[PDB]
Amino acid sequence: AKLNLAVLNNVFSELLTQEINRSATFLGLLSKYPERKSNIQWGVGMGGT
Amino acid sequence: AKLNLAVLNNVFSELLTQEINRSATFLGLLSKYPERKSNIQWGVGMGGT
Amino acid sequence: PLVYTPAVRGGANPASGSYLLDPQYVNSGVDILQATYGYNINGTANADQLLQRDAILAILEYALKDTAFVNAIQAVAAGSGVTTPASFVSACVTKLT
Amino acid sequence: PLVYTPAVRGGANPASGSYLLDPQYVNSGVDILQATYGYNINGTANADQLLQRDAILAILEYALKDTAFVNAIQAVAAGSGVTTPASFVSACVTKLT
Known part of the structure; x- marks a missing residue:
């Protein structure tokens, strides 16, 4: 018979390590703008003269 | 997929219950004495006259 | 068919999952x-x-607590071809088929 | 005869017995x-x-981790009369002997 055998508690330490790749590299430099409109309209100038 | 289903820990509490019976009543009233000899000798007197 | 419920009495299916x-x-x-x-x-x-x-x-x-099941899985491990127990777990599957 | 070691690597026979x-x-x-x-x-x-x-x-x-032993113990539980699983283990001890 062991005295404090089955009454031992286990405690996880404070060492969470995130081990995935999540990163917005290209989204982090696109110079974000807000737009509260339905669609994005601009003019494209071809030739013709 | 729980994010802390394997980091939660099992901890007991200070509630040790004395279950075994180890009592000593008749030893507790015999008026103990320290005899440091080999054997105790006294005298018993019968009749005869 | 088998109708097993979790034998742990107060708390068969928990919210957390532990x-x-x-x-x-x-x-x-x-x-x-x-x-x-x-x-x-x-x-x-x-x-x-x-x-x-x-x-x-x-x-x-239930099974590991049982005393007749463990004397059966004791007898399989004493076979003439049971070493390095990936062969122990494969010589008990063919008993179960 | 089975030759066996505890499967966790650096903790085979512990001091405290846990x-x-x-x-x-x-x-x-x-x-x-x-x-x-x-x-x-x-x-x-x-x-x-x-x-x-x-x-x-x-x-x-080495047995509960395997995928052919958990499928071998699945098919016993879908048998005939294997209800109230104190008889599931008694219908499994007849296969192992």
Whole structure:
């Protein structure tokens, strides 16, 4: 018979390590703008003269 | 997929219950004495006259 | 057909999923087990794994506590071809088929 | 004859007798056990209960993790008359002998 055998508690330490790749590299430099409109309209100038 | 289903820990509490019976009543009233000899000798007197 | 319910009395199906096994005395004498059983961690159901989890808990709540099952799995391990126990677990599957 | 070692690498025979099992992923998918195994707490193991302890730790480490043993124990539970699983283990002990 062991005295404090089955009454031992286990405690996880404070060492969470995130081990995935999540990163917005290209989204982090696109110079974000807000737009509260339905669609994005601009003019494209071809030739013709 | 729980994010802390394997980091939660099992901890007991200070509630040790004395279950075994180890009592000593008749030893507790015999008026103990320290005899440091080999054997105790006294005298018993019968009749005869 | 088999109609197993989780044998841990107050708390068969938990909210967290850490279905804490009750401690059990495994050699019919001298040892103790003290398991847990975390639920769904790499998927949810598959509608087949609910029947395989219906047998993992049955072989773990009841079978290792039993004294006639453990004397049977003792006898398989004493075979003439049972070493390095990936062959122990394969020489008991062919007993179960 | 079975030759066997405790499967966790640096913790084979512990000093305190609390042999912490390493967690295995049991249902081939989605679950986890994280068991322990206390050593001699109700006496000693008297030269025959070492052989039963030799086979309980093999059925708990190298067998529940396997995908052909959990499918072999699934098909017994879908048999005939295997209800109230104190008879599931008694219908499994007849196959092992």
